[PDB]
Design a protein around this ligand. Structure first.
Ligand SMILES: C/C(=C\Cc1c(O)c(Cl)c(C)c(C=O)c1O)CC/C=C(\C)[C@H](C)O
Ligand SMILES: C/C(=C\Cc1c(O)c(Cl)c(C)c(C=O)c1O)CC/C=C(\C)[C@H](C)O
Ligand SMILES: [Fe+3]
Ligand SMILES: [Fe+3]
Ligand SMILES: [Fe+3]
Ligand SMILES: [Fe+3]
Ligand SMILES: [O-]
Ligand SMILES: [O-]
Lengths: 266, 265
């Protein structure tokens, strides 16, 4: 349908149309949207993949280290589950789930460029993850808008984590792929906790006006609840879990330069 | 069927030897959709340097072009097919960088600041996938030497770092520099198309590589000329897109909606 041709291709700029373009939410992201069936992802579950050698273990310990610090300094531990402390948590952490896929895709892109080789579907998987995790941030920022101290520490988190993920991927892309493997193993846990808590009425949700950003992106009918929004986010994490564990494995076997297995499901 | 059972499995390593190599998976599903007779009237344009930043973005490229042309010997003797492919192979390695760094920085910015990006990221990302497809195409028609393979490696480093700091310091300057580069690229890509029509250049690669035929939706009958003609249209989308984006920065509009995302929908 699109009216994008050579009369538009010879224009100097479209700076002038800018004031008259709607801000329809579906533009926030590409159309590689995930399609989940609520009754099917409902039975998503908690898995754990056994570390194989030193690097796998190094990876696994730092995630157990990070979970333990974060869970204790952020007081998630004692007190009853709350809406406030769930979304505040998911808000902060989602800012750092967006970085990995962008360092991998970006570096694998540069490699594809300098040795002039075919990537075989890897780049477009990691960048849709990154995107899909950024949409996880976008949704929670419709739910809780943070204040100055939480914002400043988000900025320093990215400084540090961008530097770590970047230099960790260059030296061991299996490490970073293992690391998100396990990262997501924890993200699956936390979320099924939130659903279990709703189901056992310990956290009866007040944010049921599910944001338009999330309705379009996950194609949810108006009558969707917070629990239905959470499950889909949790379903996305189970995928990344397998994707980064498959990716790490593939490296272990020296299949870096082989077809991205998840191309078939499309 | 992509459901819980597949999500609840640990690894899909056993599946690697059973999944086949398919040219359609080398990119995303966001492909250029051109019609040959329409895009035949793409044209060389030149934006006016609007101020000290543009003037610098323009004077950088012009000097890069002059230097590269006397150093590569483009102008020395006749146009040959090897001289064109050689050149565009080299240059299309560099071209994939800018959209990536741009795409990356803005991604990052929406995460720390927690703000809508409103369509820039994708456009800037498929823009880098597009140039890389030009590249994957040119690697089919020539497989460069060791001297050139080294020359290509080191040039990534200088260029990557340059754009990294460039985009952090001033994204306006980068998009302009990119806009300007893609003027020059259309000049080359029409010079080539013109050399064909005259018979100063007789291509022998009028068998267009598989990757390129499903990327651009071409026919098995399409030739070298036709391929240069779809690419040129890509280089003119990056020309407009990036000069617009840089006008948006000049006006403090870099957090409005990317206009092109309606110019599709
Ligand atoms: C807290 C951690 C795991 C649990 C976890 C996750 O790993 C992730 Cl990834 C998510 C999204 C959730 C969602 O609620 C989540 O609960 C370990 C990582 C800690 C850091 C990186 C610190 C902050 O630097
Ligand atoms: C010679 C240059 C531009 C002309 C040009 C283009 O800009 C582009 Cl983008 C293309 C595709 C073509 C077509 O082949 C092309 O001929 C600039 C060179 C820059 C460097 C050597 C380093 C990186 O700074
Ligand atoms: Fe995650
Ligand atoms: Fe997430
Ligand atoms: Fe190009
Ligand atoms: Fe280009
Ligand atoms: O996440
Ligand atoms: O290019």
């Amino acid at each position: 349908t699109p009216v994008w041709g050579h009369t538009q291709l010879n224009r100097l700029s479209f700076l002038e149309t800018v004031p008259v373009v709607p801000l329809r939410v579906s533009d926030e992201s590409s159309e590689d949207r995930p399609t989940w069936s609520l009754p099917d992802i409902e039975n998503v579950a908690i898995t754990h993949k056994k570390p194989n050698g030193l690097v796998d273990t190094l990876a696994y310990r730092s995630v157990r280290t990070c979970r333990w610090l974060f869970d204790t300094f952020s007081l998630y531990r004692f007190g009853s589950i709350t809406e406030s402390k769930v979304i505040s948590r998911c808000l902060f952490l989602e800012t750092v789930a967006g970085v990995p896929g962008m360092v991998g895709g970006m570096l694998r892109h540069l490699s594809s460029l300098r040795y002039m080789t075919r990537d075989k579907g890897w780049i477009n998987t990691l960048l849709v993850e990154a995107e899909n995790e950024r949409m996880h941030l976008m949704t929670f920022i419709e739910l809780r808008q943070p204040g100055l101290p939480l914002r400043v520490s988000i900025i320093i988190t990215q400084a540090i984590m961008y530097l770590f993920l970047l230099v960790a991927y260059v030296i061991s892309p299996r490490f970073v792929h293992r690391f998100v493997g396990y990262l997501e193993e924890e993200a699956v846990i936390t979320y099924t906790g939130v659903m279990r808590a709703i189901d056992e009425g310990r956290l009866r949700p007040t944010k049921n006006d599910v944001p338009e950003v999330a309705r379009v992106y996950w194609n949810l009918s108006k009558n969707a609840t917070f629990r239905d929004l959470i499950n889909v986010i949790r379903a996305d994490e189970a995928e990344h879990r397998v994707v980064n564990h498959t990716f790490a494995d593939m490296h272990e076997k020296r299949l870096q330069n082989s077809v991205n297995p998840f191309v078939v499901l499309k």
